[PDB]
């Protein structure tokens, strides 16, 4: 029962999440108000994942899809212009949660439209 690696990245109104495995099948959807869970196995290593959120997401307006070889997920927050210091609700010495600097920016969210 292995564990996939993950990806924080707040912006203005949302948080998105990049998992990580090759050719995973049967993606286990779990859109808990304050939790996220997935038990997708890869084409064998069985991967499972659960995380307590830092804040209240919107299980209503969220899309989950698969890209290639990583699972992607995305959700809107419950605020206006605030910024999460983590994804979970705890002491983040979490080994497998690391930041996705590709999508990460913050501080300059809608604040990079010049040259």
């Amino acid at each position: 029962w292995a564990q996939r690696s993950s990806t924080t990245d707040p912006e203005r109104n949302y948080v998105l999440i990049t998992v990580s495995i090759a050719d995973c099948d049967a993606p286990e959807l779990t859109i808990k108000p304050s939790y996220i869970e997935l038990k997708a196995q890869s084409k064998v290593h069985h991967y499972q994942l659960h995380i307590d959120l830092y804040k209240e997401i919107i299980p209503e307006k969220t899309m989950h899809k698969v890209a290639n070889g990583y699972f992607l997920k995305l959700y809107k927050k419950d605020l206006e212009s605030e910024y999460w210091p983590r994804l979970t609700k705890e002491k983040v010495k979490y080994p497998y949660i690391k930041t996705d600097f590709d999508k990460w920016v913050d501080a300059d969210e809608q604040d990079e439209v010049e040259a």
Partner: protein, 618 residues
């Protein structure tokens, strides 16, 4: 009608890719091996939380370099976890399989990760300097297995039958390319490690056979010594003697750091930082841009790069420092982040944090002037080259004044010294301290019940430029000035009394022809004969003297005894002259140098001086 297939990159090449893909910087093999060895001890160490019987096999956690030139071999001993048979096989097929899995799934209720290193290549980089490798590992999970390769498509595994046993861990034998023997050299290994892998969590042991025999004496050494990373420990848990002792090691310096700023930032960046204001300026230069790079950056304990202009703006140059993140900014294979958005952020902080640090040193009588005698420039420099911190930086400036001569003064003091009847800050600049001090240049501002600063450094004016609005207050002087009524008594006569010198006004404008714009006789002076105020919204005469060095309006004092003579002779001689030729221009030229001016036409003037010793004393 499809047919799926399995990617199958092939090795011979893939290796030569990793190794030969250049990196005219091939010392990294060591760094990489050590890293990989820290990784190992870090592994067993943690494995002892719940079972410390695992530690029995070797009570010490260390790595030991052992140069054996005699067979041209570089051994790297480590007492970390070591690999079983299968742990060699599996974990030594490239990239995939890394001692990361071991930490991928840790999830622990403490979850400590002293150890980072993925990619799962770093090992192969040994071939950069090694022709053949010899891995001997022993894990208290299997026997002593020997894993041997020559960068080929193949590797061998055998049970070590004869060859000294080890308690637990791994030994690496490097057979260096027949020239890479640079790496059997004491100084070299010291150079490399004590610069790339300095701040490891583990003692960095190095054998160096050295004898004092009368014509061998081995010595397990370099536990040396304040290796230790002073950012991993709580600020409170350190005072002077510990911060400063660190400084000295990381900057080959002899004096104590005037100040120090430990701190961190968290959120999604997560990096710690120590930074020092040194006691003295180098003293080197600088803005050659050729030299600077003091703030050395480490990710997860390992040295990455060191730099200047990404983290630290030019003018903060001097700040010796060090940064570290766990949240590995990513790095194409181990020498720079590659994502300079990261860079920018760390910069913001290392500034914001570093500014308050001055603002702190600010709260002090003398230890500030000790700092201000050191970096007067670099602050002023920062004022010019910033914008946002301009104001933050503004308060930090200290000059002289006609109110306080032998005494330092900021600007937040000047604002409180001025009455409500004033709204503009007045300052002058020029050659020296005394080359302006008791100079009746602006004596009718001194006796005008206001206050003026003294800006001896040229750089000063090169900053003040970018500040024509300080706390609503305007910055002024040499240039041009006005005030209200002032005692509506000689306001009243101004027009009438200047009109006395109006038949003298244009007359003086003519014998000097075209250089001036207007020749005025203003009471912004008392007994000093004449003055040359460069027009407003125009560069200073002194400014000129410098902006030109490396590549106008004429004021007369009416009450001056040598000027009343002019009004008399206006009648006794106007448009032309005979005796008042060597004089009309002469004083104009005198008042020129008076207004911090160049030796413009420097031979004709001298000749007037000795030419006006001709009638008086002869």
């Amino acid at each position: 009608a499809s047919e799926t297939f399995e990617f199958q990159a092939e090795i011979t090449q893939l290796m030569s890719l990793i190794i030969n893909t250049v990196y005219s910087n091939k010392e990294i093999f060591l760094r990489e091996l050590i890293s990989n060895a820290s990784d190992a001890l870090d592994k067993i160490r943690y494995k002892s939380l719940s079972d410390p019987k695992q530690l029995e096999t070797e009570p010490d956690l260390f790595i030991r370099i052992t140069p054996k030139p005699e067979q041209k071999v570089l051994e790297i001993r480590d007492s970390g976890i070591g690999m079983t048979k299968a742990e060699l096989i599996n974990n030594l097929g490239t990239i995939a399989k890394s001692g990361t899995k071991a930490f991928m799934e840790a999830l622990s209720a403490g979850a400590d990760v002293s150890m980072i290193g993925q990619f799962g290549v770093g090992f192969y980089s040994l071939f950069l300097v090694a022709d053949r490798v010899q891995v001997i590992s022993k894990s208290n999970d299997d026997e002593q297995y020997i894993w041997e390769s020559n960068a080929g498509g193949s590797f061998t595994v055998t049970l070590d039958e004869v060859n000294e046993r080890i308690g637990r861990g791994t030994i690496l034998r490097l057979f260096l390319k027949d020239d890479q023997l640079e790496y059997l050299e004491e100084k070299r290994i010291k150079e490399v490690i004590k610069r790339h892998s300095e701040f490891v969590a583990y003692p960095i042991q190095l054998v160096v056979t050295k004898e004092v025999e009368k014509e061998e004496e081995v010595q397990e050494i370099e536990e040396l010594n304040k290796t230790k990373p002073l950012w991993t420990r709580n600020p409170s848990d350190i005072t002077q003697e510990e911060y400063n002792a660190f400084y000295k090691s990381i900057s080959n310096d002899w004096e104590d750091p005037l100040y120090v700023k430990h701190f961190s930032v968290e959120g999604q960046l997560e990096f710690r930082a120590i930074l020092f204001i040194p006691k003295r300026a180098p003293f080197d230069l600088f803005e050659s841009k050729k030299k600077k790079n003091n703030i050395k950056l480490y990710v997860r304990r390992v040295f990455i790069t060191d730099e200047a202009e990404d983290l630290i703006p030019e003018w903060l140059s001097f700040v010796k420092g060090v940064v570290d993140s766990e949240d590995l900014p990513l790095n194409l294979s181990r020498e720079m982040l590659q994502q300079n958005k990261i860079m920018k952020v760390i910069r913001k902080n290392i500034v914001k944090k570093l500014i308050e640090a001055f603002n702190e040193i600010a709260e002090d009588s003398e230890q500030f002037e000790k700092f201000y005698s050191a970096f007067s420039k670099n602050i002023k420099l920062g004022v010019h080259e910033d914008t946002q911190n301009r104001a933050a930086l503004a308060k930090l400036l200290r000059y002289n004044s006609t109110k306080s001569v032998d005494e330092l003064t900021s600007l937040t003091d000047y604002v409180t010294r001025m009455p409500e009847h004033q709204k503009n800050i007045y300052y002058i600049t020029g050659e020296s301290l005394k080359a302006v001090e008791k100079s009746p240049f602006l004596d009718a501002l001194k006796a005008k019940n206001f206050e003026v600063l003294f800006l001896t450094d040229p750089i000063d004016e090169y900053a003040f430029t970018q500040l024509k609005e300080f706390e609503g207050k305007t910055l002024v002087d040499i240039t041009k000035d006005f005030e209200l009524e002032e005692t509506d008594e000689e306001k009243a006569e101004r027009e009438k009394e200047i009109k006395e010198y109006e038949p003298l006004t244009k007359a003086l404008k003519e014998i000097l022809g075209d250089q001036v714009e207007k020749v005025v006789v203003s009471y912004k002076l008392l007994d000093a004969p004449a003055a040359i105020r460069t027009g407003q919204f125009g560069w200073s005469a002194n400014m000129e003297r410098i902006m030109k060095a490396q590549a106008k309006t004429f004021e007369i004092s009416p009450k001056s005894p040598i000027i009343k003579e002019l009004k008399k002779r206006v009648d006794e001689g106007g448009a032309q002259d005979k005796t008042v030729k060597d004089l009309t221009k002469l004083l104009y030229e005198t008042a020129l140098l008076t207004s911090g001016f160049s030796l413009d036409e420097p031979t004709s003037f001298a000749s007037r001086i000795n030419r006006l010793i001709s009638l008086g004393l002869n």
